[PDB]
Symmetry: D2
Subunit: 456 residues, 4 copies
């Protein structure tokens, strides 16, 4: 069915409300035109991010009451460890408080200064941890991924030709690892095919190169494979997920996404020495290998949530609800990234605001504008997020200048999607009303989080 109903009931609710346009206007100014700086109670439907904003189930809340809070040997850790071993198939697990905790560990463990890390497009925290540790990032995604309007399947795939080139021009020993993300967040939540995962494994293995996945949205990815990759139609999400990771040497994971929790993450690997070193390091930044900066109750919620994510009807509905928002927007002629990805609809800021150049930050501006007319919060995913080149000092110039309508799992309904789509269509009517922005405060890294702007 095109748009299935929620494969669950509502157990408990929280109120939503909208403050007037004029109140929202004061608010957008006081946040320095950065949606990141608005306050939760001032937001009606909050599509800033699907990170940590998911609704847990009654089963997970039951596990929340059974937190075994021991510093060492918590039953919750054993339950997480066993679940991840079973479902992802890696030998070892190190819990971390969230994803960038596990990225800090991997980057410190796996990178020698001056080595290359090659990935299917960059992510902000991931790239920063690679570069802080002295790696050079190389984008090996296909060119097509960078074209917003181009509707092709598995836009997340690595270009094997580009991978071959890197191996030829630099030498295998100078490549720390391949970073393969599932889905690809900045491409619009685009999936990677199993075929691509296999071919990447085969080539890297022949040269002795390691492959570490970013598992953050691996279930959404597995959904796309089931739906769209020939041969996978009668496979279960869990089977698909276990095969995906069989082509990897380990993974980083933010549980705050596809594990259906509000906090939590982990690092997995197969290598014993790397496991031993990872435990030496987790102690510095996170906590004991037996809790990694998480309460026992959160290891428990995350163990239960990751297994709930395997239910076909859950993930089908998750992905199709996002698709519904995109379909409504597209039917009205609103320009979006296509095809719609697993977790968000990305409005194409370049087309929405054809009158601005990327230098007056159309994407930051539109996000503000949607808040002002709508009370819906959305996120900048363009030139601001891309940050500065640390060799030249200029803005990285992404081809994708996008505004992200990001959907938390199990929180909103199709009627909420309708409210969002209506507000956005009206704003489209007068797209030309959206003004250029300029920096008034710029952080030294990850600048999009707390940067502040003024109109040009």
């Amino acid at each position: 069915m095109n748009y299935p109903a929620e494969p669950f009931r509502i157990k408990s609710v929280e109120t939503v409300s909208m403050i007037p346009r004029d109140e929202r206007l004061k608010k957008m100014q006081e946040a320095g035109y950065n949606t990141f700086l608005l306050n939760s109670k001032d937001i009606y439907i909050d599509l800033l991010t699907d990170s940590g904003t998911n609704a847990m189930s009654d089963k997970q809340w039951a596990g929340m009451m059974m937190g075994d809070e021991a510093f060492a040997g918590s039953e919750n850790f054993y339950h997480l460890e066993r679940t991840v071993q079973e479902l992802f198939g890696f030998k070892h697990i190190v819990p971390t408080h969230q994803g960038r905790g596990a990225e800090n560990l991997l980057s410190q463990l796996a990178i020698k200064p001056g080595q290359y890390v090659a990935g299917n497009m960059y992510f902000t925290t991931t790239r920063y941890h690679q570069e802080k540790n002295g790696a050079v990032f190389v984008d090996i995604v296909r060119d097509e991924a960078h074209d917003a309007g181009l509707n092709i399947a598995f836009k997340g795939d690595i270009d094997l030709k580009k991978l071959q080139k890197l191996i030829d021009e630099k030498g295998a020993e100078n490549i720390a690892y391949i970073c393969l993300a599932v889905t690809v967040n900045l491409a619009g939540g685009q999936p990677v095919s199993m075929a691509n995962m296999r071919a990447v494994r085969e080539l890297t293995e022949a040269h002795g190169i390691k492959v570490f996945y970013d598992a953050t949205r691996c279930v959404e990815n597995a959904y796309f494979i089931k739906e769209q990759e020939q041969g996978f139609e009668n496979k279960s999400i869990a089977e698909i997920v276990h095969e995906m990771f069989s082509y990897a040497d380990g993974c980083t994971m933010s549980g705050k996404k596809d594990c259906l929790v509000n906090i939590g993450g982990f690092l997995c690997m197969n290598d014993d020495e790397m496991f031993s070193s990872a435990k030496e390091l987790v102690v510095v930044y996170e906590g004991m290998p037996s809790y990694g900066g998480l309460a026992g109750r959160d290891m428990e919620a995350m163990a239960i949530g990751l297994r709930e994510a395997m239910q076909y009807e859950y993930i089908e509905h998750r992905v199709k609800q996002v698709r519904y928002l995109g379909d409504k927007l597209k039917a009205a002629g609103v320009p979006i990234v296509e095809p719609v990805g697993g977790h968000a609809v990305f409005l194409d800021a370049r087309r929405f605001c054809e009158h601005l150049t990327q230098d007056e930050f159309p994407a930051q501006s539109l996000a503000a504008s949607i808040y002002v007319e709508t009370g819906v919060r959305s996120m900048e995913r363009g030139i601001i997020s891309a940050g500065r080149n640390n060799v030249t000092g200029e803005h990285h110039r992404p081809k994708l200048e996008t505004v992200r309508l990001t959907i938390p799992r199990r929180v909103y309904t199709y009627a909420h999607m309708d409210v969002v789509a209506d507000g956005i269509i009206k704003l489209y009517q007068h797209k030309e009303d959206i003004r250029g922005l300029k920096f008034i405060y710029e952080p030294k890294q990850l600048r999009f989080f707390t940067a502040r702007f003024d109109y040009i």
Copy 2:
């Protein structure tokens, strides 16, 4: 909006199975085609009743952690007490575990054997307690309420002329009280007007007669007054609620309906001496005046929920959600009781299954078909629920042969309403295929709960 979006978002979800049609058919058979005998774990959308099946808020769940479990003098009781005094404007309140507990107390307190209790139709528990305490029931609802097709506003209103007639024929002193229900469940959830409540108060007061309300769905009732009664456009739900009860000497309430909880109710009154007698009685059946057979956490959740029920956007959506399901069914020509009430849609199974005789249990069979085709549980409200005649062994044969689609508050979405509507509308496009049922097991009493059937 004809249909506003949910004025809340989802905090937590309730896991459901999603079993396919073929398994649902096995479950229905194991249940002897009686939806009352289905296991909850086997049902996707459970529309058996809106009683005690509501989703609580995060604030209510917070209060669930603050239960003061004292047997006497719990802080949660004082919170419940002042909330009800504030919102309903009654002087005194006695908590009960649910509605029929309050009804038990009222009927023992307020009836002398042989006296009459007149009301706008009746509900089974309410009327049961009236009769077992010696009252004669007299229906004083307007005749229009008995016409299930008549699309008229405030169909729950008492006919003042019938009340006048009762006064003149039996004498004021032989009338124990008037029992005014808001809304009227038996008529399909039909609201009573403020004008009618005032007229009833004025006539009864001149004769010294008491009026007690069944407040169970008073908040749905208040929404209808707000939406449709000239002059109440500028009034809040709370103002309407407080005015409604100013025309009463007291009430009984099942909190499991409009107080947005899973258990709880209470008895209110203004008379000091009745309050005293009520407290003497509550200890025999329920508990102390300050717990009434409720945990402290539940008095707290009900205090919080009743106040949440006053929010305009909440009750508006609650009622418009039910209306959406009714509207969609009606647009497809599916026969329903009209107008659609505050809490449920009733299918006219006599008309739906015209090819079957009432002796083939059309409503019981339609309810079975609906579950098989959709995973939706509904309640038979026809000849089966009517029971078998005490003395002759004939069926009691009611005019209403209906299936009730009863909607718990804040549990389902419009997409779930589409599951229900689409399934029923498909069944209706080939209704003649629906098969008659026969008893294979019939208990001597409460046959609707445990009887088993097979297809003719």
Copy 3:
């Protein structure tokens, strides 16, 4: 060991505090010298009752998050039903919101007007439901049970000679049933031996008389059997519990005691017809046979709690903590009921206040006095509770005029017990300071709950 440590850890806490003596004095006056009328937040350690005041475990709180709130077919009901079948061994179960709900059902089901019900001492609600339904109560406990200071084992036992006499003088057909309580609350929480249960079964069976247990404190009872009855020392609590009920035709149960919950109860029986009739009746007073006036989450907590009660270390500690309070009091010469029972220490009001007669209510007075000097709340269990004879109109005159220090399960520590014992010993120092009381308001039944007094 004499005084074992708690066989659990503290998971969560609530603050306790004490308001000054003068504030307590105003308070005791405004409650009309009835501890029942004080407010929970004005009480420092609340020993009014062990009914519904117990601390639940983390496992039960986990079940509280998994309430299946369906009106029919709740998984929680199936879990309760199965647990009670397994542990108590009765065929059928009907949930009720609490104990007196199940007593209302049994008394209506099993008593013909003018029949006798014979019991091992009376309880207030139990006796009232017997008499409301037209039974005459006969006390068949041994004489020894009525002597407070007499330290003998299994003071709860029925006098078989007294039972034989009743059978001889009235005829078996005029005895509705034998009511056998475990433990015996008003005797001081006194256990009944297995031998006595067997002999009672054997004699009643030969005459065709039914035996229904009051199961409210059956686990405490089972503890005493394990500890003190020869042959039972190597049996498990669960084994002992299952044998106890094998000598009964059914039971009433307040779950609010030994099932470790804050609300809940049930009625059990073996007879099919009586089960069928009980379901007809529960619908009138409580709710459906599938929930009996309980939320699904409470059926779940009660199923889990009853099974936790079977843990030997739990019940051993439960009973020995009470014994510790009694041992400290006795070592200081404070007069108590002996031996100390399962749930409470009962101060002997007659000996504490030798200067008053029972007619100036020493027990009500002392309870007030302990509150005033201590902030510890305790309960009257003497002449006030015993009520009036409904043939003569005079006070029932119990030989046991007692003040109950009642211990909620898993809430307090030995240090709390020490605070209680110290305060009470000091009050003993000046026992003569405690004044006579007289009624100023007397309820028509169960008068102790909300009766109000003034000093003579």
Copy 4:
């Protein structure tokens, strides 16, 4: 009181197994006689650490249901913010997932390579982050702190003469900051006086040097000031806390200690520019300025818990409970570090097991014996935790060969303290029977976590 009763009662309990000695011996062996390798489910009383193992209140659990899970601008953050501003009096606050996260930020913000950080002894994570950022550590604690038997008040005080010496020898500009810990964990949980904090503030301020506090057990510290520092008799815990931090430029805190939570911490500072830099850094390691790697519910629980920690009766009992265990051990002649600290009792295993050499791991073996005999887990803080020398392969051989009995807040009773004390005192009456241990598995790093032993 020498030992007050608990100023709370139990709301809920945590289930524990209660396995007998013979099974405990098997568990210890399966754990290779290393208590760090025990499963939590196998332990009765877990005194491994007071970090993150505290029992929350009912109010905290209520706040756990009110988590506003927004990625930015959560209401729970603003609550945490204003609570810390109010209670600590720092201008700015950045949340972190726990203490070492705050330490990571501080040391990156406040240290230039080659600079000195001087402090009253150190803690391992704290000093680690100082060194890895280029600092040289200098101990400026009073010499008395190094004498574990010396029974002296405020043993945590900095020696102003050592600080003066450092200033004159290295120059103020080469001192990054002074790190003042309250209490001092390494000295046995020894408190610092207000006089010392003021003297340190005055000297450092004259030279332009910053002072940052490790606030982890500041509330235990404040209790000692209240109890023992002349002039603080009339001051509340809150007044003492606020005055303490007025002598600092900021702090790092592990909320998992004195904020009564299971996870959480924060970084405070007064300097506007450092606050700005801190927010730029927090996003790399932890999360947004308004969540810092914490769920919203946890910022809420920590806001509520920190305020609960200010209650006099609570902290008084917390500290006197630890003191009770120390007093009892000392009265029996069991050798301990003196005076007993705010959070733990340390057994002198060198003296306890005089018959063993440090090479036979007396503390590791005593910790094993304690578990076997009582079901109590303790932490080795001796030669094993000291590690093996980087370059020579010799053991690092510490002066302190101790077993730490670390007490989580609000989890245990005096009866549990008796289990611990009685078990240790019995072991001590035949200490010579305690056997030396030898390595059977030794990892290359963090050997205390995973090493395995057998008896010599």
